[PDB]
Amino acid sequence: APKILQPEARTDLSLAEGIPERANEYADPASIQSLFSPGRYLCELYHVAKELHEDGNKLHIDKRRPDLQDLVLNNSNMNQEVSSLEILLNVLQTKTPLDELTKDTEAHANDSSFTLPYDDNLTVINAILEDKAISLR
Amino acid sequence: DGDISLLPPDSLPLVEKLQTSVDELLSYSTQKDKIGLDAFSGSYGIYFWEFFFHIPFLASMRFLNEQRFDLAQHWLKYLLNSAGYRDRNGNLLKEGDNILYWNSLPLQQDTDWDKNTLTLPTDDPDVIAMQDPMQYKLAIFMRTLDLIISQGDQAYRQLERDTLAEAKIYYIQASQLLGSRPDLNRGHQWENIKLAEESRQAENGHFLPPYNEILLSYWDKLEIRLYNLRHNLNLDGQPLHL
Amino acid sequence: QLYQYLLLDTKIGHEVKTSPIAEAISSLQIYINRCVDGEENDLHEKNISTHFSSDNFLHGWNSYNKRYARWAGKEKLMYYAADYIDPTLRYNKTELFNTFEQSINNSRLTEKSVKSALQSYLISYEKLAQIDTIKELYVENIKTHFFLGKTRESPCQYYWRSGEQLSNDSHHLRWSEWKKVECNINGTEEKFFI
Amino acid sequence: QLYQYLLLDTKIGHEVKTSPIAEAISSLQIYINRCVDGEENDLHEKNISTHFSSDNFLHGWNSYNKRYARWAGKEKLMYYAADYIDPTLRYNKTELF
Amino acid sequence: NTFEQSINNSRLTEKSVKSALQSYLISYEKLAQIDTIKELYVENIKTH
Amino acid sequence: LQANLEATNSLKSAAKQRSKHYKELLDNGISSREQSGLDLRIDAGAVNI
Amino acid sequence: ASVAPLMLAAALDTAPNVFGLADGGSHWGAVPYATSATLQISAGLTESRANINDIKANYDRREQEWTLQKNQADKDAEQLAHQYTSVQEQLNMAQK
């Protein structure tokens, strides 16, 4: 535990300033390459989290979501305002593609709202005809 | 038993120097011979840490909180003075060629601590700062910069052009204490790592502990306030000249 | 059930926006919060025995590691004690420090008041710098010394202090303020033993 | 660097107006504040030994002489004690007072 | 009542509630040493 | 009407500044001196016992 | 400063008082009475310090309220400048 404190004790900064003691090799704050970043927190949380199940289980992270293994730690991935409901659709289309829904058969196992005998094409036509103030009638 | 003294150093010269000024008491020459280095720690060490270091702290921060800035600066001159310890007849008070800047005694040297295992329960920053004195050394430097920019802001709220000319000099002095602004993102540039190449531990060579936050924000404060001074903007961006 | 499984909001609207590293952080926080609370049926115990130790990640989960803000505050408080420090809030403040701190507590301060409080501090210190250590006691279970100290007056006025670790763990004992023993020793009488 | 050298604002706009004696005062105050703080590389020590005495100009620099207002207040308090006096605030007040 | 109005701060810390807990145990340890001498069984009011 | 728009913007900015002021008061809670003066009363009641 | 004379008086009261074929006169409970009186003085001192802190806190709160009122009066002046400009341009419109 003081062996963690000693690199925290020797550097303290990386501007020279003369009178306090400084060591080199800093990073820009508010970036993934920093040490208190969301990237470092994500790295620590992932390397904790992939050690809680056996690798052969179905509850392991790389077995339930192979997407998180290949996430690029980049400042573009940090700061870009990507919308949600895109990531969900990408993860759901990773397992089963979208054309499987159009090719799908009938009479499924009693789901709510009955959306499963699904055709994307009629939905696209209907939603394009929504805002244009044109019904099929 | 075993080279531990229960005795204090002699309290008579401290009473000799109470009757003179405070400046002849809270000085490095009285902290050399009359109080040891190893005697600054030890049995009566809490009183000496407090009396020669935390008394100018809670004096100067109390003067800052009550907005007496010209006397708030005077009590940080008993901790950090920038080439100013002279003792009334020239004589910058060097050790060898080292011009003395830190009046306090544990801030003068660079010491190693060996005891403090498992700070992970102790969330106190003061125990961490008593482990290595560079934390207090950074704290006094940041309070000096806060106090100088507060004196500049005090000479900026009166909005007279003589007072603005008086106000610009404090931001000059703050930019002279800070030195020159360092570069950023110019050592071990971040390669796009896909999070399965990482390790659990540190020192992989990629996460690289950063530059300070408050000393980085001081450059931005001085930049905004000098940009307001070099036009007729106020602090709110309001033009003084219509 | 699918939200607990795939760690992603299967009922979210279109107006919510989230950067991908933040969404990965949220998914792993949901996964750790499910795995700590025992809701995982088959799971790996002999690493849980290592991560729920005295000082590892999952022991300070609810204290620090549930949140990026609290984790950042802990990792910056241990790397910058200077940014989070103040002369008022401090551990191991002496009683003389409380006397000094609330003697200079004026509004339009002068230097006379802080010099008078400084004189009162040195006058109070000069009494404690004359305490005469008489009796020792080394407790072996709690690794502490205890001292009994008389002052240099003809009335006795004993005191006590303690060093709080091994005498040779380092050069430093963790010492203590001289505090007054309160009852019935302080009469002007003469003692066979104490 | 040029601002530290020529003592004049090399990035100033056009809206700031300053009388020439005030600008000379500001330039010399910048020069003294640079020379006191040891930032001058080669400089004259055996007059600095005379100006940082018990009572000369550069000893009461930070106390009084950094500012025209504080300097004027000190030079008028020693030349008019009558203007700055009051019966309440007084040194050596007895307990009977 | 001694404990309840000792932790009655505004921005509480854990030091204050641990100090009130110590004061509670120190006050309990005195009552855990009371030495019962004399008994009395009232028969009308069914009390000892 | 161009002057009336800038007379309405000042009202809107004043209302936003007043709401920001009371939000800062309500988020800062009680002061440090208020907390000190209420801790010392309990620490003084603990020595009357 | 009224703490050490009480403990010194209770130290002196435990000395015997009567001499000459009548031993004693020493007050036995004097040191616990001075302990109680000293601790009452400490309680009154700490409540006086709490009163000092509350007075200064009320001064800080009314400084914050003064700052709010000053800012609202500045915003009212910035409103009334534009409203004066509006009424002056109405005057120009009527004068045309």
DSSP states along C108-154: S--HHHHHHHHHHHHHHHHHHTT-EEEEEEEETTTTEEEEEEE-SSS
Cα–Cα dist A83/A60, whole Å: 26
Chains in touch with A (3+ beta-carbon pairs under 8 Å) read: B, C
DSSP conformation class of A91: H
Chains in touch with C (3+ beta-carbon pairs under 8 Å) read: A, B, G
- Tell me how far CA of residue E21 lies from CA of A27, B105, C93, E16, in angstroms: 47, 40, 22, 9
Residue C81 contacts by C-beta under 8 Å, 6 or more apart in sequence? Answer: B125, B126, B128, B129, B135
Q: Which of A14, A26, A52, A68 to mutate to test the interface with C (most CBs of C within 10 A)?
A: A52
CA of residue A128 relative to chain centroid, distance = 30
Asked if E2 and F49 come within 8 Å (Cβ–Cβ), the reply is yes
CA torsion through residues C68, C70, C75, C77, sign: positive
Q: Provide the phi-psi class of C65: left if phi over 0, else alpha when psi is between -120 and 50, else beta.
A: alpha
Asked if G31 and C107 come within 8 Å (Cβ–Cβ), the reply is no
Residue C70 contacts by C-beta under 8 Å, 6 or more apart in sequence? Answer: C63, C64
- Tell me how far CA of residue F1 lies from CA of A125, B6, D28, in angstroms: 47, 84, 53
Residue B12: count of CB within 10 angstroms of its CB: 11
The continuous run of DSSP H or E covering C163 comes out as: strand C159-163
Cα–Cα dist C88/B57, whole Å: 9
Q: Would you call C24 an interface residue with chain A, using a CB distance cutoff of 8 Å?
A: yes
Query: Which of F:5-44 have CB within 8 Å of G?
Result: 6-7, 10-11, 13-14, 17-18, 21, 25, 31, 33-34, 36-38, 40-41, 43-44
| B234 contacts D15 by C-beta, under 8 angstroms | no
Residue E13: half-sphere exposure toward Cβ, Cα within 13 Å: 7
Cα–Cα dist C61/B216, whole Å: 31
Q: Would you call G96 an interface residue with chain F, using a CB distance cutoff of 8 Å?
A: no
Q: What is the separation, in whole angstroms, between the first and last Cα of chain D?
A: 59
Q: Which of C5, C9, C10, C31 to mutate to test the interface with A (most CBs of A within 10 A)?
A: C31
Cα–Cα dist D48/D40, whole Å: 12
The continuous run of DSSP H or E covering F39 comes out as: helix F32-48
Q: A80 to chain B nearest CA, in Å?
A: 15
DSSP reduced 3-state for B219: helix
CA torsion through residues A20, A25, A30, A34, sign: negative
Q: What is the number of CB-based contacts under 8 A between chain A and chain C?
A: 116
Radius of gyration of chain F (CA): 21
Residue B29 contacts by C-beta under 8 Å, 6 or more apart in sequence? Answer: B87, B93
| C100 contacts C121 by C-beta, under 8 angstroms | yes
State which approach was used to obtain the coordinates.
cryo-EM
Q: Which of F24, F31, F38, F49 to mutate to test the interface with G (most CBs of G within 10 A)?
A: F31
Contacts of B121 in chain C (CB under 8 A): 55
Contacts of F42 in chain E (CB under 8 A): 5-6, 8-9
Residue B183 contacts by C-beta under 8 Å, 6 or more apart in sequence? Answer: none
Residue D92 contacts by C-beta under 8 Å, 6 or more apart in sequence? Answer: none
| C148 contacts B93 by C-beta, under 8 angstroms | no
Query: Which of C:134-173 have CB within 8 Å of G?
Result: 155-157
Cα–Cα dist C85/B58, whole Å: 12
Q: Do chains A and B touch (3 or more CB pairs under 8 A)?
A: yes
| B171 contacts B151 by C-beta, under 8 angstroms | no
Q: What is the 3-state secondary structure (H, E, C) of chain D?
A: CHHHHHCCCCCCCCCCCCCHHHHHHHHHHHHHHHHHCCCCCCCCHHHHHHHCCCCCCCCCHHHHHCCHHHHHHHHHHCCCCCCCCCCCCCCCCCCCC
Q: E14 to chain F nearest CA, in Å?
A: 14
Radius of gyration of chain E (CA): 18
Cα–Cα dist B227/B233, whole Å: 8
Cα–Cα dist F33/A133, whole Å: 65
Q: Which two tokens stand for residue C46?
A: 């002999």
For C136, phi then psi, to 5°, come to -115, 160
Q: Which two tokens stand for residue B22?
A: 């405070």
CA torsion through residues C10, C15, C21, C26, sign: negative
- Tell me how far CA of residue D51 lies from CA of B179, C191, D32, D38, in angstroms: 27, 65, 12, 14
DSSP reduced 3-state for C28: helix
Q: What is the number of CB-based contacts under 8 A between chain F and chain G?
A: 77
Which residues on neighbouring strands pair with residue A73, listed in sequence order?
Answer: B193
This structure's resolution (angstroms)? Answer: 3.2
| B111 contacts B131 by C-beta, under 8 angstroms | no
Cα–Cα dist E19/F49, whole Å: 14
Secondary structure E strands in chain G: none
DSSP reduced 3-state for E42: strand
Residue type, G36: S
Instruction: Return the residue matching tokens 């790592």.
Output: B193
Nearest CA among B97, B106, B108 for reference residue B49: B106
For C147, phi then psi, to 5°, come to -120, 155
Q: G12 to chain F nearest CA, in Å?
A: 25
For C148, phi then psi, to 5°, come to -125, 120
Give, in degrees to the nearest 5, the angle at Cα C72 between C70 and C74: 70
Q: Are strands C159-163 and C144-150 parallel, antiparallel or unpaired?
A: antiparallel
Q: Which two tokens stand for residue F7?
A: 């007379």
Residue G87: count of CB within 10 angstroms of its CB: 10
Asked if A52 and C44 come within 8 Å (Cβ–Cβ), the reply is yes
| A69 contacts A62 by C-beta, under 8 angstroms | yes
- Of the partner residues C12, C25, C42, the one whose CB lies closest to the CB of residue A38: C25
